[PDB]
From a paper:
Mutations in genes encoding PTEN-induced kinase 1 (PINK1) (human PARK6) and the ubiquitin E3 ligase Parkin (human PARK2) are causal for early onset Parkinson's disease (PD) with clinically indistinguishable phenotypes. PINK1 directly phosphorylates Parkin at a highly conserved serine 65 (Ser65) residue within its N-terminal ubiquitin-like domain (Ubl), as well as the equivalent Ser65 residue of ubiquitin (Ub). Phosphorylation of both Parkin and ubiquitin is required for maximal activation of Parkin E3 ligase activity. Upon activation, Parkin ubiquitylates multiple substrates at the OMM leading to both de novo assembly and elongation of existing ubiquitin chains that are, in turn, phosphorylated by PINK1.
Here we report the first clinical and genetic evidence of PD associated with homozygous mutations at p.S65N, the critical node of the PINK1–Parkin pathway. To understand precisely how the pathogenic S65N mutation affects Parkin activity, we crystallized and solved the structure of the novel human Parkin PD mutant (UBLR0RBR, Δ84–143) at 2.9 Å. Comparative analyses of wild-type and ParkinS65N x-ray crystal structures did not reveal any conformational differences between the wild-type and mutant protein, indicating that the S65N mutation does not significantly perturb Parkin structure. However, as the S65N mutation prevents incorporation of a phosphate group at this position, the absence of a negative charge at the UBL-IBR interface inhibits the ability of ParkinS65N to adopt the open conformation required for full E3 activity. This contrasts to wild-type Parkin, where phosphorylation at Ser65 induces key conformational changes and new interactions. Immunoblotting of protein extracts demonstrated that the S65N mutation was functionally equivalent to the S65A mutation, leading to both a loss of both Parkin activation (as judged by reduced CISD1 and Miro1/2 substrate ubiquitylation) and reduced phospho-ubiquitin accumulation. Immunoblotting with anti-phospho-Ser65 Parkin antibodies demonstrated that Parkin phosphorylation was abolished in cells expressing S65N. This was associated with substantial reduction of Parkin E3 ligase activity as judged directly by ubiquitylation of CISD1 in PARKINS65N/S65N fibroblasts. The probe revealed robust labelling of activated wild-type human Parkin in control fibroblasts, whereas this was completely disrupted in PARKINS65N/S65N mutant fibroblasts. Characterization of patient-derived primary cells demonstrates that the Parkin S65N mutation is inactive, suggesting that the loss of PINK1-dependent Parkin Ser65 phosphorylation and subsequent inactivation in humans is sufficient to cause PD.
Numbering used by the authors: 1 to 76, 79 to 83, 144 to 353, 355 to 356, 361 to 378, 391 to 405, 414 to 465
The structure:
């Protein structure tokens, strides 16, 4: 039996299997075809992942179906303090806990005394949105500039990372829409229902819909994907979020609209996994080589050039389980209770004979580590 494997490319090259051929064996075959460890490969078919020990018959893989193969190792912390996540592009090259910092938006020093602590994303994302008096001599300094750095290791004061607004530490023990596991962290989709997806699933979701070319062109935004359950008006607008796919898959995303153009005209894409390059032959030509300015292929079947003939829904309970949205403490020194009034973890005690500033979560004296890790609740 012949199925088609899409591996980090939109053309599905063929592989022979029987009914009794296992998934982990199908992987082993594509693994040694492409110089890639099979303990990193993931079989995706009609939006469901196929398990190693399943067979073609267990999978109901008919003749001339199309599977996807994608390189993401499965990675098996729930109780984390942190509130924010950046994408660190060196060294880490992955999603890490963000460390939050503020400075005056004019002089650019750590001298801006904030009118009040932030409590939500818009406070620290939207420009000129919060305020204070800079202490710097002779600085007009009216506006706070919040910036994020990777938390995992030391960072200089200019070595910043982009925030991932959509990503949350899964403190609410919410299950994933696609795979139904309680994983942390998760990406919350900006649909009505706030459907939740784990980072693994997200990866697979993006890379398959990349190979399918089922990405959505929004006139006033570029190319993106909605919430996986097809929720209306849920395109991820904050396009820095497709950086969490790693350089290589992210680089395919940056080429997508360039490639879609080449097809618009009448050209066609090189099928090699790796080279996703666009080419513009004579409309009536059947032979096509990688000329921008590697190999020669057949315009029709997209194999090494030859002669004569060429050879979703999500679950209801999963989707309702996966919605992100579905008092006073004693002052650590004086012991008298205070309420929190918003999202901010910065507390001050109002008894004037103690007046301790403290972290609401930790019950310790307020400090840069709580400031950076969990200034506010999310
Ligand atoms: Cl975040
Ligand atoms: Zn880092
Ligand atoms: Zn200033
Ligand atoms: Zn998942
Ligand atoms: Zn949704
Ligand atoms: Zn090529
Ligand atoms: Zn052909
Ligand atoms: Zn007190
Ligand atoms: Zn704290």
């Amino acid at each position: 039996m012949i199925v088609f494997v899409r591996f980090n490319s939109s053309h599905g090259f063929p592989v022979e299997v029987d009914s009794d051929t296992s998934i982990f064996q199908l992987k082993e075959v594509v693994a040694k075809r492409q110089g890639v460890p099979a303990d990193q490969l993931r079989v995706i078919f009609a939006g469901k992942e196929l398990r190693n020990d399943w067979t073609v018959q267990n999978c109901d893989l008919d003749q001339q179906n199309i599977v996807h193969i994608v390189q993401r190792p499965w990675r098996k912390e729930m109780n984390a303090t942190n509130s924010f996540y950046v994408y660190c592009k060196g060294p880490c090259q992955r999603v890490q806990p963000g460390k939050l910092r503020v400075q005056c938006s004019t002089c650019r020093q750590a001298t801006l005394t904030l009118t009040q602590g932030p409590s939500c994303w818009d406070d620290v994302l939207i420009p000129n949105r919060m305020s204070g008096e800079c202490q710097s001599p002779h600085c007009p300094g009216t506006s706070a500039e919040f910036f994020f750095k990777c938390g995992a290791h030391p960072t200089s004061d200019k070595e910043t990372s982009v925030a991932l607004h959509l990503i949350a530490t899964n403190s609410r023990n919410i299950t994933c829409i696609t795979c139904t596991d309680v994983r942390s962290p998760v990406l919350v989709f900006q649909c009505n229902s706030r459907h939740v997806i784990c980072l693994d699933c997200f990866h697979l979701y993006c890379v398959t819909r990349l190979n399918d070319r089922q990405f959505v062109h929004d006139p006033q935004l570029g190319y993106s994907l909605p919430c996986v359950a097809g929720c209306p008006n849920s395109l991820i607008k904050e396009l820095h979020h497709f950086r969490i796919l790693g350089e290589e898959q992210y680089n395919r995303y940056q080429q997508y609209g360039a490639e879609e153009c080449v097809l618009q005209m009448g050209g066609v894409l090189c099928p090699r996994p790796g080279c996703g390059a666009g080419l513009l032959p004579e409309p009536d030509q059947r032979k096509v080589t990688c000329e921008g300015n590697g190999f020669a292929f057949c315009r029709e079947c997209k194999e090494a050039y030859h002669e004569g003939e060429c050879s979703y829904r999500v679950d209801e309970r999963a989707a309702e389980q996966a919605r992100w949205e579905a008092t006073t403490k004693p002052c650590p020194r004086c012991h008298v209770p205070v309420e929190k009034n918003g999202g901010c973890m910065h507390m001050k005690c109002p008894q004037p004979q103690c007046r301790l500033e403290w972290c609401w979560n930790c019950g310790c004296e307020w400090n840069r580590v709580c400031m950076g890790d969990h200034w506010f609740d999310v």
